[PDB]
Design an enzyme around this catalytic site. Structure first.
Site, PDB file in Angstrom:
ATOM      1  N   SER A   1    -108.686 -20.227  42.626  1.00 28.59           N
ATOM      2  CA  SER A   1    -109.763 -20.758  42.186  1.00 28.59           C
ATOM      3  C   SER A   1    -110.766 -20.357  42.779  1.00 28.59           C
ATOM      4  CB  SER A   1    -110.064 -22.422  41.526  1.00 28.59           C
ATOM      5  OG  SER A   1    -109.636 -22.292  39.982  1.00 28.59           O
ATOM      6  N   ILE A   2    -110.162 -19.893  44.318  1.00 27.74           N
ATOM      7  CA  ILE A   2    -110.680 -19.186  45.244  1.00 27.74           C
ATOM      8  C   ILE A   2    -111.130 -17.715  45.169  1.00 27.74           C
ATOM      9  CG2 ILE A   2    -110.508 -18.719  48.009  1.00 27.74           C
ATOM     10  CD1 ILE A   2    -110.456 -21.556  46.935  1.00 27.74           C
TER      11      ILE A   2
END
Lengths: 400, 400, 400, 400, 400
Positions: A66-67
């Protein structure tokens, strides 16, 4: 004196890391923390590669999940500041390839703002609409493709997986976490900027000094690349099956180290807090993003749910917990922003803990104040949010 | 020079221990090894108690399981050397409480020798005779209660669990591993010796300098006692449920350390090898058991199966692999004896690797020659036989 | 004295290894040699894994390719010695799934002997029959699927790739190297033996003490596993694309180390040479295979071509160069057997150099006499036959 | 203590050198580094001559390419300090042999300053003007003879190759890297100084203690001369074809070692930094060039492009990256100067990393402060700028 | 270096002391140890006086019990060396007040030697002869007044308590521990020496530098005197009732510190070991007692039982465990002498661990070699023998 004071909190953080590693049984784990914009501790435990007996190091490279969504949101904000992107305009203006969709026989439109907050109704990996609807209804009542192997040449071709899938819910009505929405966002970025998404992200990384960050590609050589492991039905460690993430570049197809995540968090914190220190000193360098844009981000959105923390709400590609105090001598809620990413065979977390500033601290202090904690693991289905929060609180308490 | 030479094999043994610990995910492990009757290396890894953050130590105490069966066999041999015990006499002579049993309407009798080699046909924890028979038939064709809580006051009362259970197979016909047979053996020991089984075992331990060995009792305080952990259906570390082992004292109700197991192995090796060094020197102390008795033990019995090594056969309460060489330049089988014990929440292994002696070595060398390896773990369902064998082979190769 | 004498040839062998490594540019290489059935030198150069900086070691595991065909031939010979396999019977007796084929409208049959020598006419990876025929015709005039990803559950299913492909040439007429023939041979082995091919091969490895040999599977953990690299169009080192070798287990789907190959070569040499030393001593252990079977193997077959040596001919799954001497003071041909295997991203070679025995040497010498050389590399399209031959000749010359 | 502190950075530099050598596959490489004007580490890897098995040594001599252009610029600056050379005067004053040229029917003139920065429009090895113009236009839109064998007696005769070639672009309008411009500069040097170019360069080398530096000539004997290798179409190492560099003496016809390059870099750094330490001590020796001249050099010129680093601009025969800092906690640009030279069969790089000096360091420190890194390779088309920068940064960080 | 080496064993001894204190719940404990005749560690734990909050100190004074018997035996030996005392003469010669006694109507006599070893048959505190006889018979079959308040002016008057009590067993027949026998021994000492017993003991203490040792008297002031506590039926700490020990001066009516006990043990060890070092050096001072007398003491007597150690036998007022080794690699018995004394409200122990001396150590070492351990506690019914033995073994092992 700085290291002498930072001699007790490091021990407690290492103990907590050992505790979580033993609880989950992960082969290895890497932790990286920065205090007031300066890195103070980096350490790795276990083995990055069990087969070749490679110990974990701070330079080890793992998946971040999700970064990638967070970085895509940063790129979208950068494009919006230039005026080339308009949030509420329907996506068909930029991407005519996406067909117009109707919900319950009613003309509806989806915007970039809905896509950012996962309110467009785009389906997730689950295909059965009935099961998703039943699960959401059950959750409301209580309150009251992953292993793909094909390589995709361009982001436009990635839309073929879900371009014909009907919307599960009315846009802007119910929160539904999804990853194809970020693929559509990457397509929007490519269309608006006029350049390749990968080139734009590489330029952003170079500007942010995130050198080690790069997408997942098997053919090129990547130094200090680690491996990923899962437990089988016999409770024995096995290797993660090989997968392709060409269509999930914006949704989790990226690799990075702890240092790059710390730098990104420090840059975001500086951009957030620069707008308040301006009246005290005019010599401070401008932030990477305008303070108004940073205030627009990290702002909780109604009807959104923070999966890894029930006390927070989903901001623009972030999980933000607002400061709260209801009764006397009761629980005092702290203000922090974090995002947890979980990929196949690996898990990661990034947490930002801003400091509480009074009218006197800002008189004789630098703008970037806070604690940044980053933890990366090579075991799937691991929740590291609580450990990161505890480590950040320990560092904040022990800050001389 | 002894430690300087023993500087490479220790590293490899530690690496193998780390490899197996990471493969199984055990919270902690303890290893102890003795070379030529002298301890050379003891080390522990992980945490003995995850809750209280207690690191593993060489003095940590854990369950041993089948080492209790081995010690019971040693006591039986000691009693037999005194002439108070006769192997082929039916057990009803010593224990009239056990009823006479008939197989297929035929009068049959069970002896202590059959009980030692698990040939009496006494049922295991499994109750359905049909399932056991089907499994044994399938295995032959291919070739061609545990969580009890009650405390038992005396060994005689323990027979109530299986005194009325009919025999599964004809005595001395098919191999069937069982633990109630060793309870019957303990009852035989109590009847023949005229004293309590625990007192006799304590006397044996005191004679063998195995001070830390003691039975499993919750009420008394036992220092350096560790904990036991299992993985749940969610792949999360949990605590082992509390169980009572009052009826399995001869079958696994014992606790000990690595040092006691090393001492026991060294004593057994000396007793085995003393019978050959007598002609070279008359000043050597007599072994704990007569050489003829030691030769009678460790002797493979036909129709018996070694579960943890297909190349060996079940000796008298031991697993012995005979030296073998069939073709030129092919695999050369080494001679060694070992026993693996697995209890709830823990696993352990004890291996003995005798040295090959020529007519020249025995002229100017001490009788006890060989390598003893002991490994104890606090995770259930772990196979440590291969790791122990590899460590023993490494030490034998590196022996300057 | 043994090492003192073997101090010059080792240096020359290392120099030759460096020369070939620099000529081809391979990241790493491992060499293993045995003299008279005893290993005398093992060394590795370069890095097994460039990304993780893992140096090459003698215990490194790499692909072996055609060594799998050699082991399959060994298994076939073992089955034939038991009388369960008949060479000249058509394969339809054992595998009815394979349809009967006709060449030029004529009823023809294929036998196991034709499959072993690649005379059955089964097509190779090339699909165009016209191109193959043109190439063979051009070669005669001058003289006068690889990257598959699917996993196959059973060897029978692997036949689907080529069961419907018509034969390229008449059986037993023209030599045509192929790998699907060995898949058919594995199916024959499974049908005749009645057990799984992998189980039989594992039993053979255990008998031959080839512990580290195992098939290529991604999910299980394999220690000391190396990586494979190729050069791109820009002359830059890249990673080998991931491939599946479930259908090429008999044709190259295996991994092993130098020690296992040395043991296999020593066993084959002992089996070959035991039939001559019998008259001198009756105490020698019997060979793994009967001397008549070993004489049947390594026998050159007419109309067969040795690809890596024009002076030899293709024996039964081996490349044998017969001793030859035509003119005085001219080139004297040495007798040796070798097989070169080349897979994707890796190359390997195994060479056997029997010693010339007179009527006096066999009187007071052990049966296994010769030199075994094994070289494994992690670079594709590398010819190591000449280097292995030179190293073997150097060791033979320097043998005190 | 100096070597004890410089024990970690050397290991990392060696690891990086091994990494780049394995990535490119070069037969050999030599590295030389100086810290604060003192050499601290010199090492060579691989073989200088594969045929004769000559290992690489710090005294090995290889081609340097653009270092010749740098030395020519140094000679030009030395001549200009004496007043014998005037930059903006047209070159026809010194060399009447060069004909006057007109661009688009307009009278234009070329100066030495334009030639130094490659702004005179002189064509490169490419002959088709249309292709060059198309490539430059495409690059602008996106932003918005080598194997000659003849020997030339004198530099004037070398002008015959390009004296009649029309200018590709207007002088001082577009950047175009070229080498014939430096031949014209050498002719200018010969005309102005009144002596042979080689004699002047030899005098400069003797003054700078660069003894081993010498031009490329086949007939004279040069000790420790290495060889050059290329990869063919079959990915096999071959020898570089013999070429003559008599007309490229100023453009790459020179050979030197790492020590001479380190001495030259140290001299340049001292000349740059002497102008600031004068106020602190009057006992310091004067620099080789006046501080004003050194400031004039290493100054970025607008409309110039740094090929090997997009973050820099082309200075006077140098590549200089200016210190830059735009946003808070973002990438901080370091100030350094470097030049990369690539010849046939060889590659080289020279990097200078000046130290950041405050008002307190200069009070009690010597003027020459910085890190000099030199790397020479015998493989063509190799980029060593990033490796040199990383090594310099590692040494700067590890400087106790 | 002495303290640096003695840094690990002290920690283990303190840990063991804490363990035993917590196990028994004693309010306080004091430990004192001497190595090779030199005190190395003294420490106290808990509170000497709970009411007044007085912490335990090394100078704290407590009861010693059987140490009084040991000192009485020392005085008897000193008198015997002077020839004034004869062991086998009947006691009626020295004390006519004691009436002649007959056992089973047979004339019998009691000697001092029988009294020392508790073989005279004098009754203990128990009065019922039938109960004592039954207990002794039961013990044999299995193998096969305290709170008095009156003050006694003279030792002769103390005989009134048991002068008319008939003997329980035949003299010199059965071992029976008793304390009135030592009162009779004190009377014998007074009669033979012609002086008061207290004066003689005070002279002995002054000679032995045992200044703090003194009898129990309430009226005189004694500094650092502690208190004694017992647990009631409600498991609550209470005070020990006041008692008078005027008639038990030889049997436990004494007080001392750890230092005095250490000095006494060192003197005894020197007296024992001086007889062996005489041949090596004539400059050594003579021991307090002749070596023959010391050999006569500490000699196990047949038919005697060591209550606190089943592996030893009762020597002359001492508990001695002889060195023993029966089987190879089995338990090796160490040689040591100790005596445990238990009074009302307090417990104490004194242990002596002689060192094993070879023919080489005595050449260049001082005569007094060994470890002395003394532990005093203020809680009744405490067994400190095992803890003292463990501490002594730890110090012996850690002796650099």
């Amino acid at each position: 004196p700085c290291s002498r004071c930072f001699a007790r909190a490091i021990e407690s953080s290492r103990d907590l890391l050992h505790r979580i590693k033993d609880e989950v049984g992960a082969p290895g784990i890497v932790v990286g923390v920065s205090v007031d914009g300066k890195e103070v501790w980096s350490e790795g435990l276990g083995y990055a590669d069990v087969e070749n007996r490679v110990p974990c190091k701070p330079e080890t490279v793992m998946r971040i999940a999700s970064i990638s969504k967070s970085l895509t949101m940063v790129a979208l904000a950068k494009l919006w500041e230039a005026g080339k992107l308009d949030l509420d305009i329907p996506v068909q203006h930029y991407v005519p390839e996406f067909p117009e969709k109707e919900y319950e026989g009613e003309k509806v439109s989806v915007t970039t703002r809905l896509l950012i907050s996962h309110l467009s109704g785009i389906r997730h990996y689950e295909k059965d609409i009935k099961k998703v609807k039943e699960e959401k209804a059950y959750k409301a009542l209580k309150m009251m493709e992953l292993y793909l192997r094909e390589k995709f040449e361009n982001s436009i071709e990635s839309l073929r997986l879900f371009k014909n899938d009907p919307l599960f819910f009315k846009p802007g009505s119910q929160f539904l976490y999804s990853t194809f929405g970020y693929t559509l966002l990457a397509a929007i970025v490519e269309r608006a900027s006029g350049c390749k998404y990968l080139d734009y992200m590489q330029k952003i990384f170079h500007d942010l000094d995130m050198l080690t960050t790069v997408q997942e590609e098997n053919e090129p050589v990547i130094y200090n690349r680690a491996r990923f492991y899962v437990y089988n039905k016999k409770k024995r460690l096995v290797n993660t099956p090989y997968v392709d993430n060409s269509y999930k570049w914006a949704g989790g197809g990226f690799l990075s180290t702890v240092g790059d995540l710390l730098k990104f968090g420090n840059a975001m914190l500086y951009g957030y807090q620069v707008g308040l220190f301006k009246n005290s000193n005019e010599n401070l360098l401008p932030g990477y993003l305008k303070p108004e844009t940073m205030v627009m981000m990290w702002t909780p959105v109604p009807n959104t749910e923070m999966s890894w923390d029930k006390e927070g709400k989903y901001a623009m590609a972030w999980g933000v917990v607002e400061r709260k105090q209801t009764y006397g001598s009761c629980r005092k809620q702290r203000h922090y922003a974090s995002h947890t990413g979980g990929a196949v065979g690996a898990s990661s977390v990034l947490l930002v803990l801003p400091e509480e500033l009074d009218t006197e601290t800002i008189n004789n202090k630098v703008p970037p104040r806070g604690i940044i904690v980053s933890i990366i693991c090579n075991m799937q289905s691991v929740g590291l949010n609580s450990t990161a929060l505890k480590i950040a609180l320990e560092f904040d308490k022990d800050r001389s």
